[PDB]
Structures are given as structure tokens and as C-alpha cells.
Subunit: 217 residues, 3 copies
């Protein structure tokens, strides 16, 4: 239904001790990163937000994070979902803490929101009040600054990003040009917490406007 | 069934009147681009042809044109389809004129055509008699010159492109190396209108030939 | 079930005699690339291995080879599968021999293997004893050198690759970072034949290990 949360799910979790030199080199790991935590899930941008939160709760860095082509609904295998993330830390203890924090966030009630009856249009309008080390690096902002994390399907996102930019004193940090691997689009916007919230609200309203009247021009 | 039109459908259309500077930058718009026209549909190359047609009698530029991964049949949301296009113009009125032209073309009877009994193989063989500003730029020809816009699934397209090039006095301008985002392939060929027509006919026949004997 | 072969299937095969010069240029064909063999199939990495074999068996080069987005299961048309390969040679006969060698290999018993009961996790762990001209070029090794060709879905692959690198005296030549077009991941590793074989076995076991307990420590 409209305004329902689309529930995100974790599919697979694994820890590696004493990562191989070859893999460390290929992943451009820092010397302290001896352990890796792997995770996959069926919702990419929620998971990216979750991994960022994990960098606040534990001594881990996000060293790999990528989306799958055509989204979770089109996965051909059980554990692929639509995202893989890799946390790195000095030992399995730090990594375990980071994975647990990631899991907790994914199960916290955050998620994409449905814009219609059969949940075939949905969006993400998440105000991150304090970034961790991953989304702050992605956006090119100081760790701890706020972000509006806005994602919707391609036309909805372009229309709604424009509305969001006009509604608040925010800057465009990163543009996810359509298509992302999952055939969405969006942006990371920064500003005061107030400004990011205003942008989130305006984005949500604008996506809903297009969902309610897709051919109205 | 074979030779049936695969009807293209427009899914969403919206106009942005006074585009924000932040978006103008990320989209690399020109200073005279004040308004945007957004469109999505369930068939990309038809939409690209329609956008180009819109540039012919309206002051609009195609500033964004991208296809969706794995095509319209694999779309996960209702309005994504398999293409997004953005027109930019001096005003919302002129953008609307541009979109009106685009929509008219998409509904004109152009489209992908089925090559077999269950429509599981299809192709585009469109003679663009007179290009606009978009496809002429893409192919590297003069606005107003002709193109054969040829698209099919990957093996069929390679086989049929060779057939078209042998059949007609045309040059390859742009090659859509397999896979495009939709897992198709094709090319833009240029030449006289009669040569592009001869290319189109030969392409269609060759795609049909492969569909009829894919392992021979 | 676990250890079942996922049978690879060829969907289309065609020969172009005397390719038009216009095509020949865009495909980056060489003066002796006068004719083309085209093949599509529903399994990409087995086809890449097969095309590499063809370069040993016949006077052909692999001039084009790409995977389709989101894999064969999501193909929208009948013949797209998840891979297109193009062989080129001096004559239709050498291309014909090339394609015959490709087809022979694809039906040889090679393939992805299931890691679980419903075959929803699968992997490729192929020891190429002696590379042809295609995979050697891809890996940056000399033709004739051995490779472990390792592919699995993203988490399984990252885990099992790291396991294979620890298990055997191999080096990573090429990393297929997740996602490939098919939403898999893997690598080409080189070393002696026995070492590549050791990496393959280690890769396969590590993928099976994840498949048998996808949620790791959450499940203990
Ligand atoms: Cl674990
Ligand atoms: Na699908
Ligand atoms: Na079974």
C-alpha cells in the first residue's frame, strides 16, 4: 500500500580471518585491515546506509560496496540480492561488531517507501543526521555531517531531485545518474540537519506527485 | 506472430519549468536551457528516434538519453520502462511542443517488429529519412541526412548488419556493440534514403533468416 | 543437488563468409580476419573457455566476447542467452573447425556446478591445463600456461577466492569484480597445473561451505 515500508532483508554474512596478501592488494586494503566481513542483501541503498552506520559503532571501514544489475527481483542466485558490501577491520571481533551493527540498522524500520497500491513505485528519502566514514567519503563531506539520501526510479528521481534542491539550502554532493545498476537514480545532498530533512520531505512529496499523475504534463 | 508490430508505450512524461542550477551542472546543460522535458517508455530505440524527430521543428536539445539494464520486461518499477530521455529548451511551452512531437512519433506506427511465431525475437529496422540534431550528432553526419537505425539481439544483429552493409551503398557511423543495457545490438548506417531503405530491408530479412534457423 | 552439473546450452551459431570491410573495422579485425563465426549460449564463462579451446584446435582468434546483463534467466529474447562470442579466421573452413571445437568443448562435461539442494547457488572451478590465445591474453600470461578459472556469486566468490589464494601457490592475473554483467564474480589465477588444480578444488569447497550456511555466525 501507499506509504508502506518495503522491508529490506539480509541474505548472507561471512567473516574472513587473515585475508590473503593477494586479495588485500587487489582490494587496496590498509595494513590494519586483517579481517573482512562480507554481507549481501536485497536492498542496496538501505545496505549502504547500514554499512555507514556500522563505521560509527565499530572500528571498521567500508572497503567494497556495489549494486547488482537489474535489482534483487531479478537475481539469478540465492545470495546475490542486489548488493555486496565488505567491511574491513583489525580482527574478526571488530568486523563482527560492524556486521551486527549493519544487521541491526537493516532491521530498524528504515527502508524504501511505497508510492502506490502494489508497491511498484517506491523511493528512499532518508535523512542521515550524522554520517559515518563511508557516506561522508562518498559525498566528499566531513565525517559526521548530515545527508539527504534520496533514491527513486529514473524519471521520478530527476523531477523530485529538482524539487528537493529548490526546497532547501542544500548542496548536491553526489549524483547517481540513471540507470544505477538497479535502474534507479538519486543523489546525496548535504546541508544542516534541518535543510536535509526539508529536502527529504520535498523529495518524497515530488515522487508521490509523479506516482499519482505520471502522464500529466 | 511474425511481422507483428511490438507496440511501444510511453510510461511517464513531466516538465521542469525552471531547472535548478545544481541539476543544470550535473546534467551539463547550456545557459539557454531553462526548462526540461522528461520522458520514459518501454522501448528505447523508438524513443531515441522520437526524441530526434522532436528536435526538427522545436527549439529543444536532447541532453540525456539512457537505456535500463536488462530491458523493460525486467523493470522492477512501473515507470522505469527501459529508457529515460530528457529534452532541454528555452521555456516550458517550447519543451511541451517538443514532447508533443515525441509522443506523436512514438504512436505513429513505428516500432520493433516480431521475427517469429511467439515474438521472442524482434528487431528495429527504421529508415530515418531526415535526421534531427540528436541522431545526426550521434552518427557524425549533417542534420537532415538519412540513417538506417538497425537493432536486434546480439548474434542476429551482427549477422544482419553484415547483410545490410553488403546489400546497400551505406557506411557504418555508429556501432552499438553487444550488449547495450537492454542486451541488444545494432548500428547507425548512413547513405541516400534509398540506400538506407535497402539496408533496412536486408537487415529485417537477415534477422528473420536467423530466427528461422538459429543453429544452421 | 550439490555437485550436479548445470548443463550449458548453445542457442545460436552462424558463419559469416567474407565479412564486409565496414564490419571488419568496427570489430577491430586484422587482415586475416576474413570470415567470422558467431555463437551465443546460456552460460558465459564456459563459452569463454570453449572459445579459448577453439584457438588451439583451429587457426582462429577470439575477436569479440561479452556477457549479457543479468544473465540468461533474464534474457528477453530467444537467442540472447548470456554471451556472444565471435571467432575470426582466414576462411569459412577454419571458422567452421573453430566453432566445432567450441561446441565439442561446451558439451564435454565442463560446466558450472550446483552448491546446494535447489541449485540456486552454483560455481565454476575449471582448471585450464594449457591456455589458448584468448584466455592467456586476458590473463596476461604466455599462451600454453595453466589457469584456474573461478566464478561464483559475489559473496561466495570473494570468500572462496581468498580461500583459493591461501590454499595454493597461485597468483591473481585478472579479477572479475562483482558484479560482472551476469552478477557473478571471480578471477583468473595462474601457477603450475597442479597449483591451479589445487586452487580450483579449494575454490569449490569454500563456495560449498558458504552455501551450506549462508548466514555464517548468525546460524551457529
Ligand atoms: Cl562467519
Ligand atoms: Na526477470
Ligand atoms: Na533439488
Amino acid at each position: 500500500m501507499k506509504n508502506d515500508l518495503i522491508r529490506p532483508n539480509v541474505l548472507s554474512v561471512k567473516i574472513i580471518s587473515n585475508v590473503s596478501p593477494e586479495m588485500a592488494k587487489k582490494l587496496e586494503l590498509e595494513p590494519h585491515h586483517k579481517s573482512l566481513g562480507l554481507i549481501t542483501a536485497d536492498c542496496d541503498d538501505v545496505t549502504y546506509t547500514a554499512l555507514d552506520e556500522a563505521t560509527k559503532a565499530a572500528e571498521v571501514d567500508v572497503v567494497y560496496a556495489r549494486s547488482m544489475y537489474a535489482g534483487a527481483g531479478n537475481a539469478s542466485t540465492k545470495l546475490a540480492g542486489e548488493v555486496i558490501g565488505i567491511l574491513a577491520g583489525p580482527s574478526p571481533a571488530e568486523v563482527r561488531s560492524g556486521l551486527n551493527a549493519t544487521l541491526d540498522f537493516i532491521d530498524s524500520g528504515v527502508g524504501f517507501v511505497s508510492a502506490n497500491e502494489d508497491d511498484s513505485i517506491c523511493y528512499y528519502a532518508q535523512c542521515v543526521s550524522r554520517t559515518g566514514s563511508y557516506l561522508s567519503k562518498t559525498a566528499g563531506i566531513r565525517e559526521g555531517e548530515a545527508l539527504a539520501y534520496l533514491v527513486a526510479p529514473p524519471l521520478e528521481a530527476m523531477y523530485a531531485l529538482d524539487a528537493a534542491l529548490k526546497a532547501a539550502d542544500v548542496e548536491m554532493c553526489e549524483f547517481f545518474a540513471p540507470p544505477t545498476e538497479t535502474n534507479f537514480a538519486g543523489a546525496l545532498l548535504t546541508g544542516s540537519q534541518s535543510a536535509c530533512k526539508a529536502a527529504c520531505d520535498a523529495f518524497a512529496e515530488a515522487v508521490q506527485s509523479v506516482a499519482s499523475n505520471p502522464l500529466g504534463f
